[PDB]
């Protein structure tokens, strides 16, 4: 072992610079040669870029898609690696993870924890929690399913949570998606017709960035 | 920069089987000395890729024994023996041997279960949601498998839509299902402007759409 540790990134707007830095307080950083690997959320794993050995005269290598905007470094005196991104787009927006090479294994061998990157011309919005019950596409079951929906809010950091009184899971969080600049994010809870209508389902939504807590009552 | 072609992207196993990720290339992989780099990596659902094998056919430091690269050139191949729990996780292949560094897709490796039909819910727009002039029409396409499915909109007889999203669940950690959130926006205008509004899902254990419903002025 010997992890590189990654730092920096956040929130920071489109247009803007970000310097991501590769600590890997391990052995031979010097002779090495770094990369970096990033993911958008979802997606597979795109190379950024490696940076070869002092012995190279620490030649650069870059995906297409960040050169002329993204610059890699690295300070062997002190074992960090630097990723200087500037002139950001949405599409920038990753999980992005400096990589231990090693001459003898091959290409990609520790990767670090990683640094996430969210790209994005917004700020604070709460959730627009709305109850989605049975109204009138029927009434039709010994079960019944209802819902939240938690519309448009940022950054992401949600909490459904559903009083029922226990009378089975049947819970589903659908993962939250971009509409627009904002989230979207749902849920479901599959209670007894026996004891609902004539009872409660609430539905409680938790948001730490904004301090809102919109808990919607379902009849 | 060489194109690699994983396959299949979705594949089925069952505790103790023998699965099998192919992999190709658009080149051949073959340096001068040092030789045919491709490698393997397992990510697992929220961690970062573990190295597999390296050039072909080397275990890393720790791979148990029952993964295994064989190939050259254009198609290599990772053998994984008796698959176990751990194992579960996205699967890609990397070629070292140009300049940019590329990846495949991935091959997400998902647990095998007996096909299973959708359980259909279908939500008008809520109250709350018009008094703010927004009309969100979803339905949740529940416990299903396997996770392919196609659903539509139709308002009015049948049209399609635009503001829809899409969130599916990962695997369901008990029960080896899928589910679907299927969300269509409207202003709400548009919504007071039509009756009939209907998903239609198609999955493999049906030729005919599951079709729900709900017409406005019914609520």
């Known amino acids: 072992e010997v992890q590189p540790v990654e730092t920096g990134g956040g929130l920071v707007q489109p247009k803007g610079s970000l310097k991501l830095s590769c600590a890997a307080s391990?052995?031979?950083?010097?002779?090495?040669?770094m990369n970096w690997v990033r993911q958008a959320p979802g997606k597979g794993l795109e190379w950024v870029a490696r940076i070869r050995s002092k012995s190279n005269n620490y030649a650069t290598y870059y995906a297409d898609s960040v050169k002329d905007r993204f610059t890699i470094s690295r300070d062997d005196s002190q074992n960090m690696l630097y990723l200087q991104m500037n002139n950001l787009k949405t599409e920038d927006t990753a999980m992005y993870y400096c990589?231990?090479?090693?001459?003898?294994?091959?290409?990609?061998?520790?990767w670090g924890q990683g640094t996430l990157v969210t790209v994005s011309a917004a700020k604070t919005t709460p959730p627009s929690v709305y109850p989605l019950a049975p109204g009138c596409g029927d009434t039709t079951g010994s079960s019944v399913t209802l819902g939240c929906l938690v519309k448009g809010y940022f950054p992401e950091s949600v909490t459904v949570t559903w009083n029922s009184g226990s009378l089975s899971s049947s819970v589903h969080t659908f993962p939250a998606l971009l509409q627009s600049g904002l989230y979207t994010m749902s849920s479901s809870v599959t209670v007894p017709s026996s004891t609902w209508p004539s009872q409660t389902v609430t539905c409680s939504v938790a948001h730490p960035a904004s301090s809102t807590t919109v808990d919607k009552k379902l009849e | 920069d060489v194109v690699m072609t994983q396959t299949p992207l979705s594949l089925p196993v069952s505790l103790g089987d023998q699965a099998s990720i192919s992999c190709r290339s658009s080149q051949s992989l073959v340096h001068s000395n040092g030789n045919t780099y491709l490698h393997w990596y397992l990510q697992k659902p929220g961690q970062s890729p573990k190295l597999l094998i390296y050039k072909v056919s080397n275990r890393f430091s720790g791979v148990p024994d029952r993964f295994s690269g064989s190939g050259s050139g254009t198609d290599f191949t990772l053998k994984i023996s008796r698959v176990e729990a751990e194992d579960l996780g996205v699967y890609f292949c990397s070629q070292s041997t140009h300049v940019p560094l590329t990846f495949g897709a991935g091959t997400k490796l998902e647990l095998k279960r007996a096909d299973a039909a959708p359980t259909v819910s279908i939500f008008p727009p809520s109250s709350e949601q018009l008094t703010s002039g927004g009309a969100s029409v979803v339905c949740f396409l529940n416990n299903f498998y396997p996770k392919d499915i196609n659903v539509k909109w139709k308002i009015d007889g049948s049209e399609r839509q635009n503001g829809v999203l899409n969130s599916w669940t990962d695997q369901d950690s008990k029960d080896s299902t899928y589910s679907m959130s299927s969300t269509l926006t409207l202003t709400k205008d548009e919504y007071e402007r039509h009756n009939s509004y209907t998903c239609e899902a198609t999955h493999k254990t049906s030729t005919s759409p599951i079709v729900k419903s709900f017409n406005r002025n019914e609520c």
């Open positions: 391990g052995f031979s950083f010097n002779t090495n040669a």
């Open positions: 990589v231990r090479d090693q001459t003898g294994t091959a290409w990609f061998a520790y």
